[PDB]
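Structure request: Galectin-4, Homo sapiens.
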Amino acid sequence: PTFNPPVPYFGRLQGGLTARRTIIIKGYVPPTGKSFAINFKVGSSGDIALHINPRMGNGTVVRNSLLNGSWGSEEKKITHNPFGPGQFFDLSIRCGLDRFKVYANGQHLFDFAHRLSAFQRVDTLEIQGDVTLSYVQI
Ligand SMILES: CC(=O)N[C@H]1[C@H](O[C@H]2[C@@H](O)[C@@H](CO)O[C@@H](O[C@H]3[C@H](O)[C@@H](O)[C@H](O)O[C@@H]3CO)[C@@H]2O)O[C@H](CO)[C@@H](O)[C@@H]1O[C@@H]1O[C@H](CO)[C@H](O)[C@H](O)[C@H]1O
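Returned structure:
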C-alpha cells in the first residue's frame, strides 16, 4: 500500500486532506496504456474534488470535479506532459487553502482551484486505470 501498490488503489486520508498536506505518487505509464485517473474523493463513493486524468491517446492532462452527480468544466492547460508512453513520473500534490498545487518531476504542472467546500471534506485517494505505481505516500 505504500510501495508497489496495485491498481485500483484505495487509500484513506486520515482526518481530512488539510492544507499543507502533500501527497506523493511515483509511477510508470505503460507503453500500451490509454488512460488513468487520480481521484481525490469524498468517501469511497461520493464526490470527486479533483479528478486528474492523463490520456495517452490525445496526450492531454484533464482536470475536473464530479460534484452532485455532474462533471464540471474541464481544465487542460499545461506547459509540459510528463505522462508520455513508457515514462516514469514523480507527482507531488499539495492541498492548498484555495487550490491544489501539483508538480511533476519537480516542475509545476498545474493549480486547480477548489470547487468543493472542503478544505477537508476530501478523505479518499483513488487511483485507477492504465498506470503502474512504484510509490504512494499518504
Ligand atoms: C466513460 C469513462 O471513462 N468513465 C470514467 C470517468 O470519466 C470521465 C471523466 O474523465 C470526465 C472528466 O471531465 O471526462 C469524461 O469524458 C468527457 C470528455 O472528456 C469530453 O471531452 C466530452 O465532451 O464529455 C465527456 C463526458 O463528460 C469521462 O467520461 O471518470 C471516473 C472517475 O475516474 C471513472 O470512474 C469512470 O469510469 C467508469 O466508471 C463507471 C462507474 O461509475 C463504470 O464502472 C465504467 O465501467 C467505468 O468506465
